[PDB]
Amino acid sequence: TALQQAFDTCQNNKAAWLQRKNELAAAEQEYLRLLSGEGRNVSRLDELRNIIEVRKWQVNQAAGRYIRSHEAVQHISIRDRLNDFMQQHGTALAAALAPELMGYSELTAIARNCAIQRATDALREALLSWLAKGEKINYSAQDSDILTTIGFRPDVASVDDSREKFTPAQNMIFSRKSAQLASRQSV
Amino acid sequence: ERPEEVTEMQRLVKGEVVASTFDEPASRHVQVAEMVIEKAKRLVEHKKDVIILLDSITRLARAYNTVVPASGKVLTGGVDANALHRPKRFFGAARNVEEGGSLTIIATALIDTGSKMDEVIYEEFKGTGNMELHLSRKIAEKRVFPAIDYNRSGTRKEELLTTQEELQKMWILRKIIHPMGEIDAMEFLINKLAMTKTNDDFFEMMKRS
């Protein structure tokens, strides 16, 4: 159930990012109504700038957590499926690639690495041999609709929000800004 | 201050202004200062924001020195230790209140006037403020107004008070201004800020250069 709980956590922080985006949209709409209207006072404007900066930082880090959680669930599902299939019919591709596997099994470490890279090249040319047809397939049997809903490519807004990057000192001061904003909101 | 300065103050600021010229004795000055600062503390106790323009810490310290009894330990300049203790807490009352309200105090100090106690109060009050703004004479000799010194000017904990984006848009000006001289930076800044309506527009006007 590790894959299922990982996907549940991915959905959880995706929903957290959605709530962050909702709060952000509220921030831009109030900012635009205040600037369009009689924005006479400027202290509220400074507070708005202070909150919106850390809000952009929060949605950036939420996009980051969403993206590497998606990568985590994708790779764990891929490795589980590969383990299951390759254990079901291990002897077939074993006899298909027997000489280099024997080279790997009873030789030294550098010879093992050479066997690994030779098998890498063999599998690369294997994939290039058949990808020309490009016949349509479906997802894994046990993980079809979960990956259909989450999708391989994530939301475009997710990758767009990750264009900008912050220095670690900037990240630390933005975390401090988030903490003080939470303290202000609590009051 | 001079009577003309205070009387043209009474008709210039909309907020209430309190003053006592040099005609009155130092006891009047010190009692006015204590009364007004304690009233400001009482006002800010009501979660009300208060801002103080103080002129001047050196004159206040001199007045307290004249009025306070001697403590028997007089340092350089005819000033004893207990004389500066009252202005210390007088200036130290500025803070930001947690639950509500904020007392901001900005004060001016006399510089190199030729009297030996002025630099005594100067050195005594350095490091006790959140920020300081410096002005020079050679800038105003050519009448470049204001005569503020950007390089000597500084602030403590700028990160909390503003955003990172505008703070970086400030350090870029800092790096621009460090190489050349202070006055040359003054004409540069006034010239390239004159035609721009606001500093916000000035930001994008200068970033492209």
Side-chain angles (χ1 to χ4, degrees):
Chain A
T1 187
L3 172 61
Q4 297 296 321
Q5 69 93 24
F7 164 69
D8 291 331
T9 57
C10 183
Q11 293 298 109
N12 191 0
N13 72 309
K14 176 66 177 294
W17 177 53
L18 263 293
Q19 306 323 307
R20 293 280 81 79
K21 288 192 293 184
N22 183 314
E23 200 280 333
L24 266 291
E28 286 93 8
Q29 60 84 18
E30 59 89 21
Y31 184 75
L32 62 85
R33 65 179 177 88
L34 287 179
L35 68 89
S36 65
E38 292 178 350
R40 186 267 182 275
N41 193 342
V42 187
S43 294
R44 42 177 171 141
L45 177 66
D46 293 328
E47 291 268 319
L48 292 192
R49 264 87 61 84
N50 268 22
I51 63 170
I52 63 170
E53 176 160 270
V54 67
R55 277 312 195 193
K56 312 316 164 283
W57 168 83
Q58 277 181 351
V59 296
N60 285 141
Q61 56 84 51
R65 65 163 55 91
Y66 164 62
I67 191 66
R68 87 290 183 276
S69 65
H70 162 276
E71 293 294 328
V73 295
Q74 283 207 154
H75 91 276
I76 189 67
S77 80
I78 288 300
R79 67 180 294 275
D80 193 0
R81 274 311 104 186
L82 290 174
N83 170 264
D84 291 331
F85 169 71
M86 182 278 288
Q87 183 75 36
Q88 181 62 255
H89 289 348
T91 61
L93 74 164
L97 277 296
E100 203 70 30
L101 293 179
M102 294 298 102
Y104 182 76
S105 61
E106 59 258 9
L107 278 174
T108 192
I110 61 170
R112 284 185 179 175
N113 310 323
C114 294
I116 286 150
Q117 62 90 25
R118 288 178 273 226
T120 300
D121 312 322
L123 292 175
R124 291 302 96 190
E125 62 88 20
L127 270 296
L128 276 296
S129 52
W130 182 78
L131 53 79
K133 274 75 69 177
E135 57 96 18
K136 184 52 74 191
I137 63 169
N138 296 115
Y139 276 73
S140 57
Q142 96 294 354
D143 209 8
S144 295
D145 61 357
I146 297 94
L147 309 181
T148 300
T149 57
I150 198 169
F152 179 44
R153 295 293 88 193
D155 193 0
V156 180
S158 306
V159 68
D160 289 332
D161 201 3
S162 293
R163 293 281 78 79
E164 66 273 16
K165 64 90 176 179
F166 299 156
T167 61
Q170 187 177 2
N171 294 116
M172 183 278 288
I173 64 170
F174 281 172
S175 61
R176 161 154 290 286
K177 291 289 183 68
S178 64
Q180 65 90 29
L181 181 60
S183 66
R184 294 290 186 269
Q185 187 173 355
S186 296
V187 175
Chain B
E1 292 88 3
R2 319 156 189 78
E4 61 270 16
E5 317 268 9
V6 60
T7 193
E8 60 93 17
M9 185 64 72
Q10 294 275 331
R11 69 178 59 252
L12 192 145
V13 299
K14 49 196 76 163
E16 61 91 19
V17 61
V18 57
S20 56
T21 70
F22 51 87
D23 293 331
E24 300 83 334
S27 66
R28 167 77 184 287
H29 305 126
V30 300
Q31 69 90 27
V32 160
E34 297 295 1
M35 187 66 204
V36 75
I37 192 63
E38 199 276 335
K39 170 210 172 188
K41 204 172 296 181
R42 285 301 96 82
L43 216 54
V44 72
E45 271 191 354
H46 269 82
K47 303 173 183 52
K48 271 284 196 170
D49 283 350
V50 289
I51 295 90
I52 297 183
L53 315 190
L54 183 62
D55 279 349
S56 164
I57 62 170
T58 64
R59 317 303 295 172
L60 292 153
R62 288 175 72 260
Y64 292 103
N65 189 179
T66 61
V67 69
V68 74
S71 59
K73 179 57 162 293
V74 172
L75 60 84
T76 291
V79 182
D80 52 352
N82 59 2
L84 58 88
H85 164 70
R86 294 292 86 193
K88 192 70 169 67
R89 61 90 173 173
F90 181 78
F91 197 55
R95 81 281 185 190
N96 169 222
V97 175
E98 291 291 331
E99 69 273 15
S102 61
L103 166 50
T104 305
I105 293 173
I106 188 67
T108 71
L110 277 296
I111 304 301
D112 61 22
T113 47
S115 56
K116 64 182 181 293
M117 73 291 291
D118 286 10
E119 69 274 16
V120 172
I121 294 90
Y122 181 76
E123 294 294 328
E124 199 276 330
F125 271 89
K126 297 289 96 176
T128 62
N130 285 357
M131 72 291 291
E132 76 292 338
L133 276 300
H134 290 234
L135 291 88
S136 70
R137 286 269 58 72
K138 58 94 175 180
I139 291 190
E141 293 294 328
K142 277 73 69 177
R143 295 177 180 91
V144 189
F145 297 131
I148 199 73
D149 199 294
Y150 188 85
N151 302 327
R152 293 183 293 173
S153 75
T155 310
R156 297 317 302 135
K157 208 70 69 175
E158 290 104 344
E159 300 88 4
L160 302 190
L161 190 152
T162 54
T163 66
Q164 172 57 76
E165 55 95 20
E166 69 207 67
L167 213 52
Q168 184 62 255
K169 210 67 174 288
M170 294 298 102
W171 291 272
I172 62 168
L173 276 73
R174 290 186 183 272
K175 311 282 190 288
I176 285 165
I177 295 169
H178 300 119
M180 73 291 291
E182 185 65 29
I183 182 166
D184 294 330
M186 295 298 102
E187 292 84 4
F188 154 75
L189 191 152
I190 64 171
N191 189 359
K192 265 67 71 178
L193 188 66
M195 73 291 291
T196 305
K197 302 287 100 176
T198 57
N199 64 334
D200 51 62
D201 184 33
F202 169 60
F203 289 135
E204 293 83 3
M205 183 278 288
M206 61 79 71
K207 71 179 180 66
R208 50 91 177 172
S209 296

